Structures are given as C-alpha cells and as structure tokens.
Design a binder for this molecule. Structure first.
Ligand SMILES: Nc1ncnc2c1ncn2[C@@H]1O[C@H](COP(=O)(O)OP(=O)(O)O)[C@@H](O)[C@H]1O
Ligand SMILES: [Mg+2]
Lengths: 20, 357
C-alpha cells in the first residue's frame, strides 16, 4: 500500500512538466 | 539527475527522469561468432552475419548477468554517455521477478557500476502510474513476454499475476512464417526487420475474427501492399488480422495457453472480490504489442462477454503505450515524495543486496 502523498503526486501528475 | 532504465525483454528504453521519452532505445541483444577457428544492441543486429544472437532477458527475467552487465555498460557509456557513478538509477523489472534476481541487479548496480543510489520498480506498475492511476489491471505486451498485472493502491498482487510467453517477437515470427509459405523470402537482417515493419504498419486486431475472415474472403477491401526495396510487392489481407489474432488464440502458433482476454479475466478473478469492480473499470494496456489498431475495442468486447452482465468495463490504451513503462519511471523518479525511497550506497554498504525488498 503506497504512501498517500506519493499516490496523490502520481494520480495528479501533469505530464507537461515532463521535459521534451 | 536520475536515470531511468527499462530492461525490456526485447528493447532497452533508457533516459533521464523528468524527460517525456527515453533518449536511448536499442535491442537487448548480445551477439558472438563461430565457423572456422561480443557486440551489443544495434551493432549486434547490424553486422550480425558473423554473430549468434542471445536475449539475456528473453522473457522479461534477466538470465545471463555477464551479458546484462554488457547491456548496462553499453547503456551508460555508449548510449546515454553518462558516468553511472554520478546518477541515481531507477531500473525496471518484470512482474514475478525472483528475489535473488532483484538482489543480483542491486549488487551489480552498486559494486560494478558504483551508482550513488538506485531503485527497482515493476514495469506494469510504472505503466499504471503513467496513466495517473494507482489501482488497475495492466496488460503489458512487449517483445518476449506478456503479463496481466492487477495492482491495488500501487502494489502488484503477485498471486494474481498472469504470464503469457507470447508477444511481439512471436507475432513477427508468425507473420514471417506465413509470408514464407506464400513464397516470399526473408533471410537477412531487415528482412527480417522488414517483416517486423510490415507487422507494425499493416497489422490490426479484428473486432470479430470470423466476420473479418468473411470480409477478407468476399472482397478486396482489406488488401494492402508493401513495397520491398528491390521491387517486390508483398500484398496481404487476412494476414493483417490473423497475425495479432494470435494474442487471443495462442493456438495459431501451436501454443496451448488461454489468450490475453482470458488471462485478463482470470487475473481479475484471482483478486479479492471487493476490488474486481475497480480492476474491470481500469484495464490499462501497455507495451509495443498493444499498439495494434482495434485491440482495446476487441478487449472491451471479450471482457464484456466473460464478466457479469452488469459490470462496468473500461479499457484504457494511452497513445504513448509503447513507452509508458519508461514514462512511469520518469515520473516516479522525479517526484518530491519519491526522493527518500532511493536505496543509497551507504544503505547498501550497511545492509547488502537484501535492502531492495
Ligand atoms: N505500432 C506497433 N504495432 C505492433 N507492434 C509494435 C508496434 N510498435 C512496436 N511494436 C512491437 O513491440 C515490441 C517491443 O515492445 P516493448 O514494449 O518495447 O517490448 P519489451 O519491453 O518487451 O522489450 C516489438 O515486438 C515491436 O515489434
Ligand atoms: Mg516492457
């Protein structure tokens, strides 16, 4: 069971922000 | 900047965390000679005529460590051009990777490549993350292996994992065989890479195999032509869908296994009855061999026929599927909340390979 803040960061991540 | 290395059964995808795509992708092949008394990746596929090719990760699990050490060396030095000593490195592993195996990867990363920190994550879990989920069931179909991986709150459920030793490379061999039977010849390297390209460009999954066979039998509408660089034109119609049909009917290549729709369903039924509704609504496809047009629709249809009549079923096939494992690693390794999850060489030197678990 993954830590809550990690889940939140994963589930809410904005795939922009990823460098081209 | 952390590194992300997805140790694919067929292709290594490697690159830097926080990037939207791997920088390097090359075959996970080591080649050697022999006929009258070692190379990696492309230059092993390239001039291979003097080479016997080996997959050290043939079905997703690393089986030859010397060859894997060569791959990783190629990766760091030759492809990425980085000093491993300078970068935290996230590695991917297959579902159901044995403990000693994950211990071995860990030791190699520290004692051979002297990484300052590392982590190992399950490929399917990374793909699920990449789609913004921590619960779901992944169908990961790559080059040498396919898995169904149900995942609950970020944890793959090991007892419910299914494995089918059939994926992209087998579909390539199958198309080659049926083209050879029709009289075409593919002896070299590209051919047989041309056959792989034919597969990728022209193959698709039928919504209903028998109906598509009838259509191909009664009209020319599904016929497509591919020009070879010597003048030969190969034309195919029903082979376009018969080839990936093998995923749903492994008997096409003489395998006795249930197909990927049945393994998806069986995987769900191994899981706690209380989470199945969440798995059914979150089927995520990943891997190159899920790139076939129509495969999500067909899976929607097959899973609907197997599941309770009321069940809400959704298949999610992200446009970036082919690299979603790598991308999930890129996200994971860049997250602020992940930064204390790295295994440091100090943590390693103090506890040994057993820290990864
Ligand atoms: N558009 C496509 N259609 C069908 N198959 C594809 C496509 N793109 C790639 N593939 C296949 O995917 C396989 C590699 O996928 P990948 O997920 O990288 O494998 P792995 O991680 O096992 O190395 C190869 O067999 C390749 O032919
Ligand atoms: Mg893979």
């Amino acid at each position: 069971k993954v830590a809550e803040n990690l889940k939140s960061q994963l589930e809410g991540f904005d795939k922009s922000k990823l460098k081209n | 900047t952390a590194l992300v290395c997805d140790n694919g059964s067929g292709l290594v995808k490697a690159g830097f965390a926080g990037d939207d795509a791997p920088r390097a992708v090359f075959p996970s092949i080591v080649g050697r000679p022999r006929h009258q008394g070692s190379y990696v990746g492309d230059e092993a596929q390239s001039k291979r005529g003097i080479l016997t090719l080996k997959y050290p990760i043939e079905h997703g699990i690393i089986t030859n460590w010397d060859d894997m050490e060569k791959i990783w060396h190629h990766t760091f030095y030759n492809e990425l051009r980085v000093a491993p000593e300078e970068h935290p490195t996230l590695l991917t592993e297959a579902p159901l990777n044995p403990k000693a195996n994950r211990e071995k990867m860990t030791q190699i990363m520290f004692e051979t490549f002297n990484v300052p920190a590392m982590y190992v994550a399950i490929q399917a879990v990374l793909s699920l993350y990449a789609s913004g989920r921590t619960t779901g069931i992944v169908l990961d179909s790559g080059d040498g292996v396919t898995h169904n991986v149900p995942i609950y709150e970020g944890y793959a459920l090991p007892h419910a994992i299914m494995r089918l030793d059939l994926a992209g490379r087998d579909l390539t061999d199958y198309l080659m065989k049926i083209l050879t039977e029709r009289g075409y010849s593919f002896v070299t390297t590209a051919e047989r890479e041309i056959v792989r390209d034919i597969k990728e460009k022209l193959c698709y999954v039928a919504l209903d195999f028998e109906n598509e066979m009838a259509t191909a039998a009664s009209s020319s509408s599904l016929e497509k032509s591919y020009e070879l660089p010597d003048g030969q034109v190969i034309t195919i119609g029903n082979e376009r869908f018969r080839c990936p049909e093998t995923l749903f009917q492994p008997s096409f290549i003489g395998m006795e296994s249930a197909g990927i729709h049945e393994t998806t369903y069986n995987s769900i039924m191994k899981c706690d009855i209380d989470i199945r509704k969440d798995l059914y609504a979150n089927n995520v496809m990943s891997g190159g061999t899920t790139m076939y047009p129509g495969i999500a629709d067909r899976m929607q249809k097959e899973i609907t026929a197997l599941a309770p009549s009321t069940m809400k079923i959704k298949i999610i096939a992200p446009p970036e599927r082919k690299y979603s494992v790598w991308i999930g690693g890129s996200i994971l390794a860049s997250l602020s909340t992940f930064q204390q999850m790295w295994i440091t060489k100090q943590e390693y030197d103090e506890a040994g390979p057993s820290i990864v678990h």
